[PDB]
């Protein structure tokens, strides 16, 4: 595929800091933890640096195309994702099969701010049937993976959502 | 895979109940993502 895995240590600033936005981006939930489990905090086993060149280079294509169409501003951010697909996507990328059909706002990929909300979505959507070795969405055996993804948002078009 | 509203790049979900929520995105191009970290965690009892 041409990806590799880069394990950081703990002492070094830029785990600290994916571990900091990972923990204090939890929320409660309005449906008590019924998907995603109930918790306040993580255990946080490992963070590895997700390398492909191509992937890369993809994505700021990408990146200087929309910023070119948008003031020279990509809005990029950092932001969760969770997904049955995670090790699809580190390999191959996000595509069409990485979807949302049923999401609110249409047929897209979906990214938190709430490393919580994206949690809700690492068994499948609304939790599936939770840990493939318990049928536990509030498992806290089983080892579960997020993404934290860089994203170009450029122009955003505003949706209230009541 | 849908189109982004004509003129925009993504749609943001504006939390507008829950005073707690943060935002969410939706982007309609894989290009426009790089999945940069992989986390392994576990959820803890409280
Ligand atoms: O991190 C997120 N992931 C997913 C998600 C949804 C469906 C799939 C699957 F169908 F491919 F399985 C995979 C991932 N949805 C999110 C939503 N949302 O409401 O869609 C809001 C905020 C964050 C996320
Ligand atoms: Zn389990």
């Given at each position: 595929?041409?990806?590799?895995?880069?394990?950081?240590?703990?002492?070094?600033?830029?785990?600290?800091?994916?571990?900091?936005?990972?923990?204090?981006?939890?929320?409660?939930?309005?449906?008590?933890?019924?998907?995603?489990?109930?918790?306040?905090?993580?255990?946080?086993?490992?963070?590895?640096?997700?390398?492909?060149?191509?992937?890369?280079?993809?994505?700021?294509?990408?990146?200087?195309?929309?910023?070119?169409?948008?003031?020279?501003?990509?809005?990029?951010?950092?932001?969760?994702?969770?997904?049955?697909?995670?090790?699809?996507?580190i390999?191959?990328?996000f595509?069409?099969?990485?979807?949302?059909?049923?999401?609110?706002?249409?047929?897209?990929?979906?990214?938190?701010?709430?490393?919580?909300?994206?949690?809700?979505?690492?068994?499948?959507?609304?939790?599936?049937?939770?840990?493939?070795?318990?049928?536990?969405?509030?498992?806290?055996?089983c080892?579960?993976?997020?993404?934290?993804?860089?994203?170009?948002?450029?122009?955003?078009?505003?949706?209230?959502?009541? | 895979?849908?189109?982004?509203?004509?003129?925009?790049?993504?749609?943001?979900?504006?939390?507008?109940?829950?005073?707690?929520?943060?935002?969410?995105?939706?982007?309609?191009?894989?290009?426009?993502?790089?999945?940069?970290?992989?986390?392994?965690?576990?959820?803890?009892?409280?």
């Amino acid at each position: 595929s041409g990806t590799i895995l880069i394990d950081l240590s703990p002492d070094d600033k830029e785990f600290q800091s994916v571990e900091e936005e990972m923990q204090s981006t939890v929320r409660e939930h309005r449906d008590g933890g019924h998907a995603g489990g109930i918790f306040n905090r993580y255990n946080i086993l490992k963070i590895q640096k997700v390398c492909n060149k191509k992937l890369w280079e993809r994505y700021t294509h990408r990146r200087k195309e929309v910023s070119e169409e948008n003031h020279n501003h990509a809005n990029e951010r950092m932001l969760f994702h969770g997904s049955p697909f995670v090790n699809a996507i580190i390999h191959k990328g996000f595509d069409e099969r990485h979807a949302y059909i049923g999401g609110m706002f249409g047929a897209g990929i979906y990214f938190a701010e709430n490393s919580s909300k994206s949690n809700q979505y690492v068994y499948g959507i609304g939790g599936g049937t939770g840990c493939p070795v318990h049928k536990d969405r509030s498992c806290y055996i089983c080892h579960r993976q997020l993404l934290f993804c860089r994203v170009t948002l450029g122009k955003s078009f505003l949706q209230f959502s009541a | 895979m849908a189109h982004s509203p004509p003129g925009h790049h993504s749609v943001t979900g504006r939390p507008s109940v829950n005073g707690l929520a943060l935002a969410e995105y939706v982007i309609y191009r894989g290009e426009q993502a790089y999945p940069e970290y992989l986390i392994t965690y576990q959820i803890m009892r409280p």
